[PDB]
Design a protein around this ligand. Structure first.
Ligand SMILES: Oc1cccccc1=S
Ligand SMILES: [Zn+2]
Length: 257
């Protein structure tokens, strides 16, 4: 099955998931000089005051922090979006080394990691139906650089010990994803896809310009996770990023001059 190795990594995904070579794949390189300012874009509205986290899961490719998405809490709207999109989960993609790990790049620069807050369009009723639609998802993407620690990340870091291996989950309540957001909501946006199989073309990407800083110690703990299950040869969960894909017939819009 797919993964991030020599024999099952991103260059192989197209055999099981032919949309890998589709017209709106992600990630992409954001060429900052080509991305045009769009003064019609609205400020992004991130309303996370009532977010209810449930659980954290090692799914064998990343860890997901999952939310209660059964009520109208934790919503993204405005920006490029029509309507309201509900937070279901966040996860990260990260490197074996500080010099790589992000999926989007900015003028070819790779950050150490990238946070994806995944939201589904409420008009489609749930996540499963939303991923069948070209406007089903909105992913807020946030870069991570290594420097100062992010205090609001530490609760996540500390639970990772308990989900080392594929299939492990742990209760994870009362986590506030507002502590993972930079000051500015200035963003780039374009139409794309999930960055993991099934690579569905449902996503309005909203990539924040301003990175967050995390410490070396915090990212080191991400790199202690395992892609394997308990009782299997250890393969560290590192370099779970898809590289940049062809832009094809797309424009990247900037919310800011
Ligand atoms: O990596 C992903 C996994 C699953 C669902 C939605 C979005 C992304 S980027
Ligand atoms: Zn992702």
């Amino acid at each position: 099955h797919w993964g991030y190795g020599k024999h099952n990594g991103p260059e192989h995904w197209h055999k099981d998931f032919p949309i890998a070579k589709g017209e709106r794949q992600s990630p992409v390189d954001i060429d900052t000089h080509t991305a045009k300012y769009d003064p019609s874009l609205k400020p992004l509205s991130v309303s996370y005051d009532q977010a209810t986290s449930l659980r954290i899961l090692n799914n064998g490719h990343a860890f997901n922090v999952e939310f209660d998405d059964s009520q109208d809490k934790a919503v993204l709207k405005g920006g490029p979006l029509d309507g309201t999109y509900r937070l279901i989960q966040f996860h990260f993609h990260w490197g074996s080394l500080d010099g790589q790990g992000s999926e989007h790049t900015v003028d070819k620069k790779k950050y150490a990691a990238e946070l994806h807050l995944v939201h589904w369009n409420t008009k489609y009723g749930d996540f499963g139906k939303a991923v069948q639609q070209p406007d089903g998802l909105a992913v807020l993407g946030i870069f991570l650089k290594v420097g100062s620690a992010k205090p609001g990340l530490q609760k996540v870091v500390d639970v990772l010990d308990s989900i080392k291996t594929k299939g492990k989950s742990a209760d994870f309540t009362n986590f506030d994803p507002r502590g993972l957001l930079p000051e500015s909501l200035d963003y780039w946006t374009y139409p794309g896809s999930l960055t993991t199989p099934p690579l569905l073309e449902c996503v309005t990407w909203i990539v924040l310009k301003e990175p967050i800083s995390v410490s070396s110690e915090q990212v080191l703990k991400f790199r202690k996770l395992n892609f394997n299950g308990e009782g299997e040869p250890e393969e560290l969960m590192v370099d779970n990023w898809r590289p940049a894909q062809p832009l094809k017939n797309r424009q990247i819009k900037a919310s800011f001059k």
